[PDB]
């Protein structure tokens, strides 16, 4: 996350990280005790999922192996369309005040809405600097028609501001008015240029796919 600040402790109990061993790979969200939602670009042969702490490596965090994952069938490596994936945990996440199911959307929040994006991705660019504490930044929703770099994607940013997501933030949540509205997808490199908004998968357009994919892989 660029030009953000540490998230208030305990305010992201539905946030997870996908690690390759102990190395950050992507963000994600906990859908339920057996499933994580992330970006399709995050695909790996297997994952270690971090839950239950704003600090990576925290001895109190839960770590769970996840062997299986399922991309949305329309995913394009070139256009970034359909950049979402479900990761099946090998063992159930233990729920508590620090591990909670995310609130999925029932409606699409419109352009102009203030939202928050969070992650453990780099805070600098092009030099990488990975924070241990989960970082947050507030950004405003931008229609894909108003987003020069781009019907199921959104952009988000603040006019004349560097605030954005970066490497390591893919798959993490963009939340608005208490619901999940986006997953970080992609943007310009180097990160953090003003008026260069990041692109997100618009979660409200994938309700059916998320529910059905989980039901088809019980
Ligand atoms: C030691 O150096 C290291 C260590 C680890 C890594 C892999 C770390 N993870 C990844 O970059 C993930 C993987 C899938 C795509 N990713 C994004 O975060 N994309 C999101 C993304 C990437 C670049 C610019 C962006 C601008 C705006 C919004 C999103 C952007 C790299 C260098």
Swiss-Prot record:
GO CC term (a single one): cornified envelope
Where is carbohydrate linked to this protein?
211
Q: Recorded GO terms, molecular function?
A: metalloendopeptidase activity; peptidase activity; serine-type endopeptidase activity; serine-type peptidase activity
Question: What induces or represses its expression, per the UniProt entry?
Answer: By estrogens and glucocorticoids in a breast carcinoma cell line.
How activity is controlled: the entry says: Inhibited by Zn2+ and Cu2+ at low micromolar concentrations. Inhibited by SERPINA12.
Task: Write out the transmembrane intervals.
Answer: none
Q: Say what the protein does.
A: May catalyze the degradation of intercellular cohesive structures in the cornified layer of the skin in the continuous shedding of cells from the skin surface. Specific for amino acid residues with aromatic side chains in the P1 position. Cleaves insulin A chain at '14-Tyr-|-Gln-15' and insulin B chain at '6-Leu-|-Cys-7', '16-Tyr-|-Leu-17', '25-Phe-|-Tyr-26' and '26-Tyr-|-Thr-27'. Could play a role in the activation of precursors to inflammatory cytokines.
List the protein's name: Kallikrein-7
The species this protein belongs to is Homo sapiens
